[PDB]
Amino acid sequence: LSIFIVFWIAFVPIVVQELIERIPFSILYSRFAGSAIYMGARSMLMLLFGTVAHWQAPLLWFWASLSSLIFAPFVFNPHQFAWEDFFLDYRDYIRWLS
Amino acid sequence: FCMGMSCCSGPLFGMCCKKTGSVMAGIAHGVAVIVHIAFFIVMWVLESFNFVRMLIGVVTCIQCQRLIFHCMTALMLTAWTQPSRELTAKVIELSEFAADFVLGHVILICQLPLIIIPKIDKFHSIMLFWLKPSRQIRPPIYSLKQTRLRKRMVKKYCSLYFLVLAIFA
Amino acid sequence: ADISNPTRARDERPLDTIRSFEYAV
Amino acid sequence: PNEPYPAWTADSQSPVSIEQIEDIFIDLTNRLGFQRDSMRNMFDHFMVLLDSRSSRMSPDQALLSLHADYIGGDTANYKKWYFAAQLDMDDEIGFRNMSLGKLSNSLEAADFRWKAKMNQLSPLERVRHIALYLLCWGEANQVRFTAECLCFIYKCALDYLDSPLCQQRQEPMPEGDFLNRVITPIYHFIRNQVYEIVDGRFVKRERDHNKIVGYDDLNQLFWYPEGIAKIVLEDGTKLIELPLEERYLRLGDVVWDDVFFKTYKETRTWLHLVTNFNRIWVMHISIFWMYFAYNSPTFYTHNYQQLVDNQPLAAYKWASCALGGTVASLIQIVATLCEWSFVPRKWAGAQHLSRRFWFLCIIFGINLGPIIFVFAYDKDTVYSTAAHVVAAVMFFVAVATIIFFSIMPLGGLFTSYMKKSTRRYVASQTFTAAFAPLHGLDRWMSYLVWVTVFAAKYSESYYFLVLSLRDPIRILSTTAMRCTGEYWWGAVLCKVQPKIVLGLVIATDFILFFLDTYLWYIIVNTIFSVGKSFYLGISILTPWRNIFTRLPKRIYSKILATTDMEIKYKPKVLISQVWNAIIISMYREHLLAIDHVQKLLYHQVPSEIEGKRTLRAPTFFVEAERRISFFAQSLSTPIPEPLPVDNMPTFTVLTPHYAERILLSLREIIRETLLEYLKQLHPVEWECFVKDTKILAAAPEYTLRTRIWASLRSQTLYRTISGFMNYSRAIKLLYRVENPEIVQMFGGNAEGLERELEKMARRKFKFLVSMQRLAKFKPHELENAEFLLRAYPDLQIAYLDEEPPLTEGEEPRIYSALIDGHCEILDNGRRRPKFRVQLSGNPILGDGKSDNQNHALIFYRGEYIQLIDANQDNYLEECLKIRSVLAEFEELNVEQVNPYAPGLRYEEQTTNHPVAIVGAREHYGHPDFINATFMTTRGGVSKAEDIYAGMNAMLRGGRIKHCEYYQCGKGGEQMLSREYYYLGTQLPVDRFLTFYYAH
RNA sequence: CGUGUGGCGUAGUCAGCGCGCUCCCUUGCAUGGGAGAGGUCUCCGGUUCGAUUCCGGACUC
Ligand SMILES: OC[C@H]1O[C@@H](O[C@@H]2[C@@H](O)[C@H](O[C@@H]3[C@@H](O)[C@H](O)O[C@H](CO)[C@H]3O)O[C@H](CO)[C@H]2O)[C@H](O)[C@@H](O)[C@@H]1O
Ligand SMILES: CCCCCCCCCC(=O)O[C@H](COC(=O)CCCCCCC)COP(=O)(O)OCCN
Ligand SMILES: CCCCCCCCCCCCCCCCCCCC(=O)O
Ligand SMILES: CCCCCCCCCCCCCCCC(=O)O
Ligand SMILES: CCCCCCCCCCCCCCCC(=O)O
Ligand SMILES: CCCCCCCCCCCCCCCC(=O)O
Ligand SMILES: CCCCCCCCCCCCCCCC(=O)O
Ligand SMILES: CCCCCCCCCCCCCCCC(=O)O
Ligand SMILES: CCCCCCCCCCCCCCCC(=O)O
Ligand SMILES: CCCCCCCCCCCCCCCC(=O)O
Ligand SMILES: CCCCCCCCCC
Ligand SMILES: CCCCCCCCC
Ligand SMILES: CCCCCCCCC
Ligand SMILES: CCCCCCCCC
Ligand SMILES: CCCCCCCCC
Ligand SMILES: CCCCCCC
Ligand SMILES: CCCCCCC
Ligand SMILES: [Mg+2]
């Protein structure tokens, strides 16, 4: 309860800023690399262990916050549905890796 | 082993593989996954149905590795003397690359049910109406020769993607 | 001929220069 | 009229003539060997200053005020250096700053003598004194970044001039002597630590910054007599051994590698965190310990059990709670220990730290001794009321020490007790702790905000620590998980799981304790901000048509300076002349259609047989819409009244340039398309422009006008120039509307009236662009630059140029040059400069724009500077309020008094803290507008770059303000700096809390 | 009947100078230089040692 009230208070400014105005995979991934990705993956492993061993209802809220944290940059990318764009981005990411 | 393979012949490396670093990177990924599965199985030796006693083991492994790397970096901050530093950097870079690879493919695979359905296109384009500019220009005309190679790449890379998915499942 | 600016005489006083700038307009 | 400085020359009350100031300048130049083409530059600068101040006051008051501002007053920098580094009076100034609250061979005696000497000078002597400083400031090159070095040089030269040595010399000093003998060696030292000579080139050498001496480390040597005493000649003798009048002649033998050293060093970052912000951990951690110990009996309870509900003695609760004092003392000791490793040991002010340690230990002791007496078993077994009174006493001693160490700043704890002759402070109080105090209602508002925040936070944290933690602590700490454990270690890993869990629980609550004060800060500010609206009377519920209907009267009262004008016209005939101007300005920018304009103008179409029907109010009062709406809205807030444009001061607009594109090339227009992109992006503008083409019209003219149209929509310099040249036409319009006798008397000679209007508007406004690559543009870039000089004849450009060495195989010579649009064309194709000034070498040593502005800064004029950048824009209706914006520095409508009057004292003076910066909005602030006299006498306008200028101005003693009716069209390493070290450890508590919770 | 020759324009002796690309470096925009890389001549078959080339069929304009 307490952590979510604090997060909402800190998140009001972003909602205020963005609710008035209404990309290749490699650079997008590198932009968030080392910031709120590796920590998130490490955190969802531990959250999964806690969930499986003993089920507490409020952990149901946590599965929300972390999930969106990883899925925000990709849900907002334009034309992410198209087959051709997705597979071209796959090619570009693979080539950037090697 | 890489350094013992004719290090005195520079052109030999170009003859065999100018970028053998990618080859050893793939090898390192494979060995990391295999050693993972080895620990999974050793933990399931007593655990024919127990899924709780390996997750925390994975977490422990990852934390210990990060601690070791951090200690090595801190020690290095303060003949073959310089090659020692070079190898210390190289191993860390390789481990980071493998972790990034696994994480990225994990992220990519999870999107499959979104793109399987074909109706998501227009419903996503509703956001274009939600967008302030809401202006789209038609794509430039492409020659059929450009279309052929595009289809070939789409088929090939899709096959490779599904092969990776099959391996992971 | 002036040392820093070769295009000006040596003996030219500052008020001569301001008058010249005025006539340049 | 037809004279350069009409406010001084055309007056008969001028105490000193122009032909008596020119020969003063010439005499100084002959005697000390300056350059001629800089003497001319500074004569022009000085005369424009006198003109600007004498157009709203008397000439004698103008000269006296300038002298007070540059050399002799309490708003002078030279006086502050003289009192700190010559009369050795830093500690008394610190005491006076401390005790100003009650105030409102000795400091009073020295001030009395200084005023007595400055009150009896002839005007000729004042002109000479100001002239020498300006002449020195004009050559100083990179020594302009270091002000106290300049003060030392000026003092030495003045001591030489009045001597019998100079006044009997026959021949003059050879030209260029000041720059060769005095200034170049210091520049050589500065450069010889970022670069090294390898195979005949200068290549930057890499080494740690803890061995690099910067501008500040030079500057700080001249703050103490102890630094001045270290300057040594080649003979090994000291400088200060010579008699006063001989030190300037030798100032070329001083070796600067044996003198300058480092004064402040960096370390790991968490040490900086612990030292800079100690007042916050003292107040969080100690109270957390108090709360946690009172509600947690289990750890100090004998045979604890909730079933028997036995409590320990109250003595044990109070003696346990009374460790907050020892915790606070320990934090302070650690902070001092971390601080001792920032500063060199023998440098002045480092003995103080040692004494500060001793006292702290004493407090630690008095706050730990008595508690042991309670916890000694001698009084454990025997209940006494003595133990109870001891615990009760030490509780309030602990409360007292927590409050004391939370309020008082670290630097300045025990200064009043030493009473020693040596340095009582770690850093100089004159140049580092001279904050401008608060007055009035905001001073009480600041106290009230913080009291409210902390009261709410503490009373709320107790009631969420009492219940979320009382039962888990009691259960997890007393359960027994009886097992065998692992015999390799034992059972010690199966009786300890509940307690490890308990430690983790407590640690997460401890971390969460810190996140609540931020929330309460946010909430209380938002409530106070809402509540103050009613007092401010902000009306947003009023209809948009209820602002537009009141617009004309606001225009009449706040844009025009109508009060001075003799009332001879109806207010409609004045407001018409402004409204129509705004509308037509918008129309010509291809921004309104032909049929839209007629809906808005005042009209004269009705009959002229009756003069009353000649003028009719628009139908409006009964991108463009956004601009007009903001104009009308901003007019509703209070605005200061203006002066007539014949009394307004002079100001400059300064711009840097490097690599940006002046105009678009034809290749980038016909290739990839940009034109189609822009047309698809701004379609209506494109159709308006093509309509305009058919209105008037290889086709070179079509090519050029298309190029212009395309450049006025992208990232171009011409867009910015054309935007900011609206000040000129604003001033012309205001001047001609305000007084119609001139327009009447000229009587049809439109040309003569045009010359008159331009001549007045030319002396009030200057534009300056600094290009550092005009010497090596390729031909098409040169073509663009020449075109700009052709479109606007009054624009000015400064650049760098180079000459081959005098002798073979040596360094080439470097000059800084100025041109504008009235210089003639040489047969080489170039223009002759007005001024060329020789430098001591390449001026660009570090990357950035600061060095770019420093070399063109000697060519500015006026009293105020506006700093813009390469991509910025402006509008006429905004440029029409410059007078009201400039009146915000609090100098235009004040009475004048004699600074050196015998009766005045320091506490009665009302001019102690001037305004340094004014920033615009849609103590941080990006500086739009700058007070030039204040800024340019204490370092540059920028430094190696914007927030640091604001913090330096604050530390030196200026004030920063914000203007709410103007808009500017703009579109990690910090925590290791000196500025944080000075701000964190010396501000009073409420200002510190306001500073911390923002940045 | 004509027709998909490297990403486009293509030209042709019974696979090319350009043009992009791709790499390097200089120059504040480029430009210029050095190095190399991208091709089944619409597609499917027949004949000829060998087919853009001789022919049959198929698609698009
Ligand atoms: O990249 C932007 C910004 O990221 C900051 O990283 C973290 C955030 O990842 C984190 O996000 C949420 C948490 O605050 C909350 O506790 O959990 C939710 C999951 O439901 C997270 O999404 O918030 C913290 C603040 O506590 C951020 O620090 C970087 O710190 C910051 O530097 C960066 O600019
Ligand atoms: C199946 C195991 C395969 C991986 C095994 C090796 C990991 C080794 C851990 C490491 O390499 O650490 C981090 C990476 O951490 C991680 O994401 C680990 C979790 C990834 C899997 C999550 C699955 C959902 C690298 O980034 P750093 O934090 O070191 O910062 C350096 C900044 N330049
Ligand atoms: C990250 C910030 C950390 C701040 C410090 C928080 C750590 C809190 C530690 C509290 C220790 C509680 C230990 C409880 C058991 C104490 C001994 C029990 C004795 C007994 O009854 O047997
Ligand atoms: C991908 C996230 C993992 C699955 C998402 C959360 C799963 C939690 C809900 C499944 C278990 C809940 C049903 C059992 C609860 C109960 O026994 O009352
Ligand atoms: C939150 C407080 C927890 C600690 C409990 C009270 C702290 C004192 C506990 C014993 C300290 C030393 C007492 C015996 C040692 C002595 O008397 O010399
Ligand atoms: C600061 C050093 C001493 C610390 C202890 C302070 C108090 C010491 C005890 C003083 C006597 C208190 C008991 C008096 C009665 C008695 O025992 O005779
Ligand atoms: C720093 C603390 C000073 C010592 C404490 C204050 C002085 C009180 C000394 C002990 C008082 C105990 C009562 C004495 C009377 C008695 O025992 O008969
Ligand atoms: C543990 C004590 C908490 C103290 C927190 C201080 C919050 C109040 C700050 C402003 C009120 C004090 C003003 C003092 C003014 C002064 O002494 O000069
Ligand atoms: C500037 C600080 C203001 C003074 C501190 C206000 C709160 C101090 C008292 C804390 C609560 C102690 C009383 C316990 C009863 C309760 O609050 O429920
Ligand atoms: C800083 C992270 C939390 C620190 C861990 C809190 C203390 C964990 C161990 C406490 C129990 C073991 C020490 C006391 C011995 C005992 O329990 O018998
Ligand atoms: C038990 C009554 C409420 C205690 C908490 C008071 C909250 C004060 C915040 C303003
Ligand atoms: C029942 C009220 C609980 C409120 C929790 C707020 C905690 C503030 C950090
Ligand atoms: C309810 C008694 C708690 C004791 C803590 C006092 C805190 C003083 C600031
Ligand atoms: C926890 C004690 C910190 C003391 C730092 C001293 C630094 C000296 C090198
Ligand atoms: C046994 C009751 C003693 C109470 C002492 C309180 C002291 C307050 C100053
Ligand atoms: C500050 C905690 C140390 C107290 C020691 C008492 C024996
Ligand atoms: C005897 C138990 C020692 C525990 C050590 C754990 C690292
Ligand atoms: Mg601005």
Residue D57 sits at the vertex; the CA angle it makes with D54 and D59, to the nearest 5 degrees, is: 50
Pairing of strands D651-657, D864-867: parallel
Inspect the structure and tell me whether chains B and A have 3 or more CB pairs less than 8 Å apart: yes
Is residue D370 within 6 Å of ligand 7 at its C-beta? yes
Q: d(Cα D601, Cα D618) in Å, to the nearest integer?
A: 6
Q: CA D164 to CA D153: how far, in whole Å?
A: 20
For B42 and E5, how far is CA from C1' in angstroms? 61
CA distances from D67 to A36, D128, D715, D898 (A): 60, 10, 44, 11
Nearest CA-CA partner of B123 in A68, A86, A81: A81
Q: Are strands D872-873 and D969-970 parallel, antiparallel or unpaired?
A: antiparallel
Distance, angstroms, CA B143 to C1' E10? 15
Give the Cα separation of D955 and D957 in Å (integer): 6
| Whole-number Å distance between alpha carbons of C23 and C13 | 16
Residue type, position D109, single letter: A
CB contact under 8 A, C14 and D39: yes
Mutational test site, ligand 15, from D389, D390, D396, D399, max ligand atoms within 8 Å of CB: D389
How would you classify residue B134: left for phi > 0, otherwise alpha for psi between -120 and 50, otherwise beta?
Answer: left
Segment holding D990, helix H or strand E: helix D989-996
DSSP element (H, E) containing D131: helix D123-139
Q: What are D920's strand-pairing partners?
A: D963
The number of residues making up chain B comes to 169
Q: Quick one: D42 exposed, middle or buried, by C-beta within 10 A (0-12, 13-18, 19+)?
A: buried
CA angle D947, D980, D949 (to 5 degrees): 25
Question: Which residues are within 8 A (CB) of D442 and not within 5 positions of it... i.e. 6 or more apart?
Answer: none
Disruptive mutation site among A7, A9, A17 for chain D (greatest number of D CBs within 10 Å): A9
Residue D266 has a CB neighbour count (10 Å cut-off) of 14
**Residue D799: strand pairing partners:** D817
Nearest Cα residue to D879 out of D766, D738, D725, D757? D725
Considering only CA atoms, which of D254, D899, D932 is closest in space to residue D652? D932
- Is residue D869 within 8 A of residue D724, CB to CB? The reply is no
What does the DSSP assignment read for D764-819? SEEEEEEES-GGG--HHHHHHHHHHHHH-TT-EEEEEEEE--SSTTSPPEEEEEEE
Residue nearest to atom 2 of ligand 14 (CA): D334
d(CA D384, CA D303): 21
Tallying the residues shown for chain D, one arrives at: 999
- Interior angle at CA D738, CA D734 and CA D743, nearest 5: 100
Question: Inter-axis angle of helices A25-32 and A59-75, to 10 degrees?
Answer: 140
Classified as helix, coil or strand, D825 is strand
What's the rounded Cα separation, in Å, for the pair B73 and B169?
36
Are B98 and B28 within 8 A, CB to CB?
yes
How many Å from the N-terminal Cα to the C-terminal Cα in chain A?
45
Q: Which chain A residues are closer than 8 Å to D515 by Cβ?
A: 6
- A with C: 3 or more CB pairs under 8 Å? no
CA distances from D441 to D100, D446, D530, D954 (A): 19, 9, 17, 21
Tell me if D930 sits within 8 A of D866, measured CB to CB. yes
Q: Are strands D872-873 and D915-920 parallel, antiparallel or unpaired?
A: unpaired
Report which of D828, D219, B146 is spatially closest to residue A84, judged by C-alpha positions: B146
Chain centroid to CA D486: how far? 66
Q: Phi and psi of D915, rounded to 5°?
A: -85, 130
Q: Residue D586 and residue D589: Cα distance in Å, rounded?
A: 6
Distance CA D429, CA D422 (A): 14
* All partners of chain B with 3 or more CB pairs under 8 angstroms: A
Which one of A25, A54, A66, A81 makes the best mutation probe of the B interface by having the most chain B beta carbons within 10 Å? A81
CA torsion through residues D802, D803, D806, D812, sign:
positive
The chains found to touch D (3+ Cβ pairs under 8 angstroms) are A, C
Joined tokens for residue D284:
């969080």
Question: Exposed (0-12), middle (13-18) or buried (19+): which is C5, by Cβ within 10 Å?
Answer: buried
**Residues D283-294: b if buried by 16+ CB within 10 A, e if exposed:** bebbbbbbbbbe
Both structure tokens of D122: 């002839």
Q: Output the six-digit token pair for D650.
A: 């002079």
A9 contacts D512? CB cut-off 8 A: no
Residue type for D150, please? L
CA at D129, C1' at E57: how many angstroms apart? 106
Contacts of residue D283, Cβ cutoff 8 Å, sequence gap at least 6: D402, D406
Phi/psi at D324 (5° precision):
-60, -35
Work out the burial of residue D916: count CB atoms within 10 Å of its CB; fewer than 13 is exposed, 13-18 middle, 19 or more buried.
buried
Chain A residues whose CB is inside 8 A of the B153 CB are: 87-88, 91
Of D920, D923, D925, nearest in space to D998 by CA? D923
Q: Where are the alpha helices (DSSP H) in D340-376?
A: 351-366, 369-375
On the 0-12 / 13-18 / 19+ scale of CB atoms within 10 A, D745 is exposed
Is residue D181 within 8 Å of residue D39, measured between CB atoms?
A: no
Helices D779-791/D717-724 angle, 10° precision = 10
Is D488 strand, coil or helix? coil
Q: Is the Cβ–Cβ distance between D84 and D90 less than 8 Å? A: yes
- CA B139 to chain centroid: 32
d(CA D28, CA B58) in angstroms, rounded, equals 83
Both tokens of A66, joined, read: 């972390």
List alpha helices for D477-542, DSSP H: 497-512, 516-536
Name the residue type at position B149. L
Which residues lie closer than 8 Å to B6 by C-beta, 6 or more apart?
Answer: B12, B13
Question: What are the angstrom distances between the C-alpha of D803 and each of C5, C7, D811, D838?
Answer: 12, 15, 10, 11
The set of residues, in sequence order, having a beta carbon less than 8 Å from that of A42 and lying 6+ positions away, is B59, B62
Taking the CA of residue B141 and the C1' sugar atom of nucleotide E12, their distance in angstroms comes to 28
**Method for this entry:** cryo-EM
Handedness of CA B8, B11, B12, B14 (dihedral sign): positive
Cβ(D653)–Cβ(D767) below 8 Å? yes
Q: Which chain A residues touch D519 with a CB distance below 8 Å?
A: 6, 9
Query: Radius of gyration of chain D from Cα atoms?
Result: 35
With the most atoms of ligand 11 within 8 angstroms of its CB, the residue from D452, D459, D527 to mutate is D459
Is some CB atom of chain A closer than 8 A to the CB atom of D522?
Answer: yes
Amino acid at D646: D
Measured CA to CA, the distance from residue D700 to residue D600 in angstroms comes to 37
How far is residue D882's CA from residue D876's CA, in Å, rounded to a whole number? 11
The answer to whether A63 contacts chain B (CB < 8 Å) is no
Find the D489 Cα to ligand 17 centroid distance in Å: 7
In chain D, residues with a C-beta closer than 8 Å to the C-beta of A1 are none
Q: Please answer whether residues D453 and D524 qualify as being in contact, where contact means their C-beta atoms are separated by less than 8 angstroms.
A: yes
Q: Outline where D438-489 has alpha helix (H).
A: 441-465, 470-476
- Rounded to a whole number of angstroms, the distance from the CA of B1 to the nearest CA of chain A is 22
Record the tokens describing residue D241, joined without a space. Answer: 């051994």
What residue spans of D609-739 are helical by DSSP H? 624-634, 667-670, 674-681, 683-696, 700-711, 717-724, 726-738
Euclidean distance between CA atoms D580 and D600, whole angstroms: 8
Q: Which of D988, D955, D729, D996 is nearest to D216 (CA)?
A: D955
Q: Give the whole-angstrom CA distance, residue D337 versus residue D328.
A: 15
| CB atoms D519 and A2 under 8 Å | no
Angle at D481 between CA D479 and CA D482, to 5 degrees: 125
CB contact at 8 A, D639 and D965? yes
Atom of ligand 16 at shortest distance to CA of D368? 4
Q: Is the CB of D467 under 6 A from ligand 9?
A: no
The amino acid that residue D991 corresponds to is: R
CA distance D352 to D333: 14
> Residues of B61-70 as b/e, b for ≥16 C-beta within 10 angstroms?
eeeeeeeeee
Interface-testing mutation among D18, D30, D34, D36, with chain C (most C C-beta atoms within 10 A): D36
Q: Which nucleotide is nearest to B143 (CA to C1')?
A: E4
Residues near D384 by Cβ (< 8 Å), separated by ≥ 6? none
Q: Is D683 exposed, middle or buried (0-12, 13-18, 19+ CB in 10 A)?
A: exposed
d(CA D803, CA D817): 13
Q: How far is the CA of B165 from the C1' of E5 (A)?
A: 40
Pocket of ligand 15 contains residue D397 by CB under 6 Å:
no
Per residue, the 3-state secondary structure of D844-896, as one string, reads CCCCCCHHHHHHHHHHCCCCEEEECCCCEECCHHHHCCHHHHHHHHCCCCCCC
* List of chain D residues whose C-beta atoms are within 8 Å of the C-beta of residue C2: 36-37
- Look up residue D834 and give its two tokens: 């007005």
Is-contact D648 D565, C-beta < 8 A? Answer: no
Report the C-alpha gap between D542 and D645 in whole angstroms: 35
| 3-class SS of residue D27 | helix
From CA D15, how far away is CA D25, in angstroms rounded? 17
D295, D470 in Cβ contact below 8 A?
Answer: yes
Sequence-distant (≥ 6) Cβ neighbours of residue A2 within 8 angstroms: D464, D512
Q: Which H helix or E strand runs over D898?
A: none
- Distance, in Å, from the CA atom of D564 to the CA atom of D737, rounded to the nearest integer, reads 13
3-state secondary structure at position B165 = helix
Cβ D430 vs Cβ D422: under 8 Å: no
Distance CA C7, CA D251 (A): 33
Ligand 15 atom closest to D389 (CA): 5
Residue D330 Cα: closest atom of ligand 16: 1
The widest CA-to-CA distance across chain B, in whole angstroms, is 66
SS3 D573: helix
Name which of A64, A38, A43 is nearest B59 in CA terms. A43
Binding residues for strand E (Cβ < 7 Å): B 143-146, 148-149; D 658-661, 665, 667, 773, 778, 780-781
